[PDB]
Symmetry: D2
Subunit: 494 residues, 4 copies
């Protein structure tokens, strides 16, 4: 059951969060955040820039000083704090879910049952990790006692996208705080509202001032400021491949800070002939159309074996046509609008390119409403590897269906991409599943399912889809700095 | 390629091994070891008893004293020594392979290509573990520095069987020595020769005196003395369920030493209807008849789906009838003789039991030769769960084939046993494989294969098949004593 | 801020807990539980026996059946349930603390600020482990895919003592439940009340029926019934060394169930000459007298370097004389009564033994009150290793102070014991701390502190103090059954 | 006991190593390698460039293709190959030690007893890791089976310096090869000889063609080609901070390849007043002057407490003056020449700067010989934090001694640096050791010792000294790509 939402939730936070206090931009400037469903302005938000970032970094650094409350706090207590924050978010679940939908555009039902649930599960998972990421006692040669201390990396700059505002915030804060680090987060200008409210809950939870600092603003301004800052130890980024390069170069040009990236993808979703038709079709649909198709791991390349291609396509087109697009607050809506005008136009452009290049338009292909940024569920058939829609990340409700013959063939074609975030295999055969799951060059390989995220399992990309992993135990590596301590002893014994 | 064997290998070691030296039993008594292929005496061996065990324990304890060569030795050097031992074993591979066959009875080809190969791989695997079984630095609450030392458990008593003489010795010494322990090994009275020769290689390898001590003798005498010894810290045993109880009781009645056991089994080998016929038949045959059927993890309960039962049985019978039984030194021999007269009679007894209780004798069922302890590859059809040959470990070339209809049914029947050492599933279906591998209550579940042992993968039993695991990283747990050291520090910081 | 205690809480639970319901003993019999501070009967409690245990095991086994709610439940949810239980315990903190004091005798202040706090921290720690105890994917030889599943051991029999009623229950349930096992707990006949109330909270928390079953009763009856049960997979025990042997023998005589023990000790507390006098004195005092001296890890052997012996003794005697003994509910009380009459007489007997064998009685040595089981803080000086009070565990407010000269000397004397649960070292010197922490044969070695327990760090004994470890990651090992699954694949690749 | 060297070792390898074959540069160009002890040319070496690097990467990629001998090879076999390589290096130990001294300049005794020894220990350590870096089976939510595969990162570009020619090669190949990766190594132009010969041993060891490819040449040419290559998956670099920036920027500008760096340092060596004088003096000397002071972790900032400053300096000056500088082949030589003319002049420049800025020259300060690049062991006293020689990495036989009063003071001064590779603490006090080891912001903190390297313990820098760790288990992280596989199962059970 989903509690009825408030289609016009009030905004309580719209400024820069530093030292557990709300601040206006030093420039006093503000930027508008739009409701993609109506195209109307929700409210103004403080436009942070370099000077605001510097204030945030200094606060975080101060909070990270040896002997500070955050540093002296027991590891188990950091966990207690993460749990408390989770409880606070759950208490305000209905509000946050609605506010998320208002600013992002995704269906309210989805924000409540999926986004918010996963946010709670992520924070509670890492809460448990706070006092369990042990260091090591090493049996080094000679008369010595050698061991490693797993210390926090320090001031962590976290730049997140807009597709999953609350979840992205959770995926970043969870591991960072669990390991005792301090954060300076730059949320997307398109969806800053929800993140800012959570900061209020972070203060309420009892987190010391400066531990978490949020700076809303634009990328080239606030974002680049964090990436090039001389006092930021680590930077985590999730977004476009283009900016990924900028972040890495900025890090190498500044203080050589640690970097980890997650930069979209063109994930192949292979459907073998022996696959369960009904299931494969529904999952393939979900694989691509999920969250308005705005998922880095979306199945944007649906490979289907020739013997079942025709039927699969027929069913897929039917499922796409039946996909209800409309007001995200209406319980019957399956697909809301795209996040903004920029994306809206970009997707329409890709659709145009698909038609131009010879791909077969089977359904949709145009705007689905006069107001807002709605696009019809579009499906392209007989797509070839060389086509643009088959190589570039659309990030919209545009499905590409390709045909293939042999398993050896699909392996090469699926791996022939600079991306490698995820992939899937639908088959009933044990050997095929193992052959493909091993052969596919991707961070995550789903078998007979898709978009199955668990705070316990790591997520990250191969090749140009990024580096490093998020979630699970692996998610703690990037937020940990290893220190070896080798002490001379009188006489070492086993 | 297998080097032509010396069918009459000379015996160089036949005494008690203590402090790198050979000793006669204090009683000066000796016992004969027989060649199961001829029934003739190979030679006499020192019959160790309590007083001999005491000498061994004292030697081991002294070698384990703080500041001793074995205690001060670099962990990495322990690895170097294990690798050296393996090299020495490989140098003498052809000799050991023959001697193994002479005393045990298994085919020389198998002793060479399988037994010795696995011995080498085991020692080399664990050699690498010597300096990698790290302790931990814990983020304990308060102003403290807490860490754990992974220390050796101490003087380890190891009582091993006769089915895999050299292999059993390696599976025991490998983990024990890698972790810096000392050993007092009691080898089987039926197969003491090969183990003794290896002791010679242990001294040649450079191991300090007292690190490894071998005491050949009988169970109730030497074995019981180790199990009840007041200065033996841990005991590892592999053999009968009956003696398993005695060992654990002995441990609890003495100094409460740590115990780990491996007590045989009645492993189910499920063959689903969609399984590859030829493959399943060959593997099901190997699963049961391997090493004269003297494997604790033998597939002694071959469950076959009714739809393929008739064909499977027909093929299994043909394969059994074609199985060459004869002189283990002849390259054409697939099956040698049983280890001794005791087992020979026991198996014959079980065979008669099978006939008596209504099981259908399909082939074999009697003695395969005039001299030696050879038994015909026997196969029972239409076996029921309640039958004795379906519940008790035969440990001989006697195959039981049962029929079943549904997968839910076979799960309950397979798990309806006090044993739980291993199990197998032959199916092409993904879901079936995962369903069964999860449902089966066994230490090891092989899918579309059987008897696949890897030094990297743990092996052990569920229920009454034993406790604890051998091989892999897990094999080091039982040979490690954990010490927590909590130091008060001026001010604890993350 | 310690809330005003309910000097005599009302008893709500006093029966056998099975399938989340309260049952009388099959025999309808009941036994009295006494308030040690007055010697008066608090109330009657159902006297469980073999038949009651049988009902509990069947309930647990049923709850552990494949496909059951407890088995299908997400690992993360088991964590949610453990956290919920903790919150319910914190809600009823004030009540539990008082009830604990009423049944056990320990000071209410200590029950609240120490016992209950530790219980909460224990449950919350393990709650986080629920979904993080990963199995492994192994790079086994040949064309195979090998991995391990970390499954629950099954039905766990947990027999606990009376010194820390609530804490012992948490230390056992925390790891067991986090790993998905089922429990049949046999609490101490002396202190059954608090544990039984927690069972009510367990039901309220939402744990499925049969997951946790508590059977109050006597040792030779209910306790032995669990240890010898044919369907109990594992047994955890904490208590006397004598009973420890009985349990291990019972296990070996029955179904060969897995065993782990914690059997008291005679922990050495080494005070070097360069130690901080004031600190060492107060700590050595706490080390011995904590919880009426009823701690398995009590520093019952206080070794003091000759150069500071005299002063240390003077100060220690003064501190002992100032130790307030009286009504546990009075905020000024530092020491309450002993758990019962049996312990009361046993301690007085040991004190008389101390006098008889030549130990120098410095203070106390007799009964501290007319009613109840109160004993005066006793301190013996010039104690020799061979003395009874220096070898046997007193478990009372009786301090043993020994003198020594060299560091090499103290190591040997400290290690010359069949016990090895804990030890301590008080020194300002780096090398001395490292030398002793490595040389001492004990499960835990405290440096410049004592009785420092953290849910993060393992606790267990060496030699005859037990086997296996509790708390920390290690605490999960004994509650985990490892299953290896090796699957044949088309072609193995790195 | 060092075997008399061959002061004029013959050069057998001086070309580019690709697919186990020797190739001339495409341009046919060659560059001279100088003997720093004489200033004379040893021989010509193929000058690899972009086109040569391309051939190498293509070879490596080919060797990394799925189904290749290197990919299909058992993980344990990779270990066998690493051990074989070590054995081959040990066989030619005397030759390589000499060749190392000839091209690098370090004393032959040190090359034999230290460099080569450490090379062997590194290779053999990692050989053991080959089949032990397990992935995980995760208890993810819902009806799924999730696990991770620890796969090789791919084609690894490794650019190494000249201070430890053979050791740097071992530190890079060991972990990369153990995890199944392929390598394209660019050795230093100053010291290419020894690495090239090892390549010949790599072939002899049995490693498949293309697994290891070495391209000798200049940095801006061959080195930059690798860092910017579109088909190189990961790059590991050790050298100057300046080039570290270039590498990371090249990576972000190219294919976003993974990067790990080790960029020198200015490691503080704190000597407390209570430290053992004689020991601290000798170690402080070794800490700085080791390998002609050409160590990234050199104790270039010797902080000494005022109360002992005078005596410490007096002793250090004496030890510096007695330090034998001369022909590295003479067994009495403690210090050889600097690697080349460029470093020679740079160091002299730094010495001149030290004098100019007010540092007190205590001894040395000039050229130590007519021919070759020998510098006198120089010691500067009364150095202040703001001085150039106190901030910049000299990388020569130039010691800086600073004075301090309090422990809190030295912490801030030691940490006031952009570097953070290593640090040391000399004290007899437990609390001071622990206070400092935790407070110091460095990758490695040595206590009462220095330059203690063990293949078991990780080494890496904090801040601008680099990112990532080498050696130990941690050394495998950067060479492993994590793949999550989540499979849908019929019904998930614990
Ligand atoms: N688990 C396994 O792999 C093996 C199981 N078995 C089973 O055991 C049955 C009988 O063969 P046995 O050799 O008699 O098994 P067993 O358990 O009696 O003998 C195995 C080892 O235990 C020692 N032992 C015997 N009595 C002992 C005692 N009182 N205290 C301490 N150690 C003692 C023996 O000397 C030998 O070293 C076989 O038919 C088969 O069912 C036999 C060999 C191996
Ligand atoms: Mg952009
Ligand atoms: Mg027997
Ligand atoms: Mg008793
Ligand atoms: Mg340069
Ligand atoms: Na917006
Ligand atoms: Na024999
Ligand atoms: Na009581
Ligand atoms: Na050179």
């Amino acid at each position: 059951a989903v509690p009825a939402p408030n289609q016009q939730p009030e905004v309580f936070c719209n400024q820069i969060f530093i030292n557990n206090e709300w601040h206006d931009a030093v420039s006093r400037k503000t930027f508008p955040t739009v409701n993609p469903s109506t195209g109307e302005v929700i409210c103004q938000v403080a436009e942070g820039d370099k000077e605001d970032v510097d204030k945030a970094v200094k606060a975080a650094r101060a909070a990270f000083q040896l002997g500070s409350p955050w540093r002296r706090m027991d590891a188990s207590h950091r966990g207690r704090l993460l749990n408390r924050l989770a409880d606070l978010i759950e208490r305000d679940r209905t509000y946050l879910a609605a506010l998320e939908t208002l600013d992002n555009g995704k269906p309210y039902v989805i924000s409540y049952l999926v986004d918010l649930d996963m946010v709670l599960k992520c924070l509670r998972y890492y809460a448990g990790w706070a006092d369990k990421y042990h260091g090591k006692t090493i049996p080094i040669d000679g008369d010595f006692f050698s061991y490693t201390r797993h210390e926090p990396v320090g001031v962590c700059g976290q730049i997140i996208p807009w597709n999953f505002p609350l979840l992205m915030q959770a995926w970043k804060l969870g591991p960072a705080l669990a390991t005792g680090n301090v954060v300076v987060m730059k949320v997307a200008e398109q969806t800053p509202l929800t993140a800012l409210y959570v900061a209020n809950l972070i203060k309420e939870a009892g987190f010391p001032p400066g531990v978490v600092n949020i700076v809303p603003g634009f990328g080239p301004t606030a974002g680049a400021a964090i990436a090039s800052h001389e006092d930021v130890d680590k930077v985590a980024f999730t977004g476009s491949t283009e900016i990924g390069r900028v972040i890495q170069v900025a890090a190498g040009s500044s203080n050589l800070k640690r970097v980890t990236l997650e930069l979209g993808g063109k994930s192949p979703n292979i459907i073998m002939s022996d696959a369960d038709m009904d299931w494969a079709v529904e999952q393939a649909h979900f694989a691509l159309f999920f969250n308005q198709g705005q998922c880095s791991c979306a199945g944007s390349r649906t490979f289907v074996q020739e013997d079942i291609y025709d039927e699969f396509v027929e069913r897929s087109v039917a499922r796409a046509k039946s996909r209800v697009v409309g007001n995200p607050f209406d319980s019957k809506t399956e697909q809301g609008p795209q996040v903004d005008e920029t994306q809206f136009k970009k997707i329409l452009g890709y659709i145009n390119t698909g038609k131009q290049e010879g791909a077969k338009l089977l359904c949709g292909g145009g705007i689905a409403a006069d107001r807002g940024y709605f696009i019809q569920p579009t499906v392209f058939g007989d797509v070839q590897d060389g086509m643009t829609i088959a190589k570039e990340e659309i990030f919209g409700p545009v499905m590409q269906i390709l045909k293939f013959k042999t398993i050896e063939e699909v392996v090469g074609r699926a791996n022939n991409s600079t991306y490698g975030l995820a992939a899937a295999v639908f088959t009933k055969d044990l050997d095929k599943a193992n052959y493909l799951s091993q052969a596919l060059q991707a961070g995550t390989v789903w078998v007979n399912c898709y978009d199955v995220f668990g705070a316990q399992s790591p997520f990250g990309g191969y090749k140009m889809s990024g580096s490093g992993r998020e979630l699970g135990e692996y998610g703690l590596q990037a937020y940990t700095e290893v220190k070896t301590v080798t002490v001379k002893v009188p006489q070492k014994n086993s």
